[PDB]
Amino acid sequence: VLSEGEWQLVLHVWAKVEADVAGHGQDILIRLFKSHPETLEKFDRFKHLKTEAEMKASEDLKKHGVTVLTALGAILKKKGHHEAELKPLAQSHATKHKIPIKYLEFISEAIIHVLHSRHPGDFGADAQGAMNKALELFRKDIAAKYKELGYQG
Ligand code: HEM
Ligand SMILES: [N+]
Ligand SMILES: [N+]
Numbered sequence: 001v002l003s004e005g006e007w008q009l010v011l012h013v014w015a016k017v018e019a020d021v022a023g024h025g026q027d028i029l030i031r032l033f034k035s036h037p038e039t040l041e042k043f044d045r046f047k048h049l050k051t052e053a054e055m056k057a058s059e060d061l062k063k064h065g066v067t068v069l070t071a072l073g074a075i076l077k078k079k080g081h082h083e084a085e086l087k088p089l090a091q092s093h094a095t096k097h098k099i100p101i102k103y104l105e106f107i108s109e110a111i112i113h114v115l116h117s118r119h120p121g122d123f124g125a126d127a128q129g130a131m132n133k134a135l136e137l138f139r140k141d142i143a144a145k146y147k148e149l150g151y152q153g
């Protein structure tokens, strides 16, 4: 569940994201929606948005971008001991929002793309390797909770 050395690479990278949570959140959701159109359909609140331009202009979308990264920052900071925060999130995405585990992987990919575009020099292969493992650990712990509830798939 990651070495201390890899957790460090991740939070160093995340300290950086914190500088503009709003910009990064807006970019991550627009990229998830562009590459995987089906995920956009899961948000009643953003369906209306067709083009990239419209997505960018939506303040509400940017607001949501902040919610998501604030919650993910709370998880990552726990350095694996994130059960209290992951629980309510796993439960609401399974039973309320109805988000397949496959969409969590798609967003994990989105996150990586944005952190590489932005912070080119701070996100070397080594930081990307540690970041990948953190997201996968989050994804495994969610899927465990999904199964218990009868929504793994
Ligand atoms: C990095 C992973 C994600 C995190 C940390 C995250 C976080 C959150 C949080 C904190 C909320 C607010 C309330 C609640 O869930 O009880 C929320 C709402 C929601 N999430 Fe996520 N989310 C993630 C990924 C996803 C994905 C990938 C989708 C869609 C494919 C999605 C679908 C939704 C929807 C539809 C809502 C409700 C929006 C509303 O109508 O208020 N989530 N998310
Ligand atoms: N490893
Ligand atoms: N916003």
Ligand SMILES: [N+]
Pocket: 001, 080, 081, 082, 141
């Ligand atoms: N964990």
Ligand SMILES: [N+]
Pocket: none
């Ligand atoms: N929500």
Ligand SMILES: [N+]
Pocket: 122, 123, 124, 125, 126, 127, 128
């Ligand atoms: N790096």
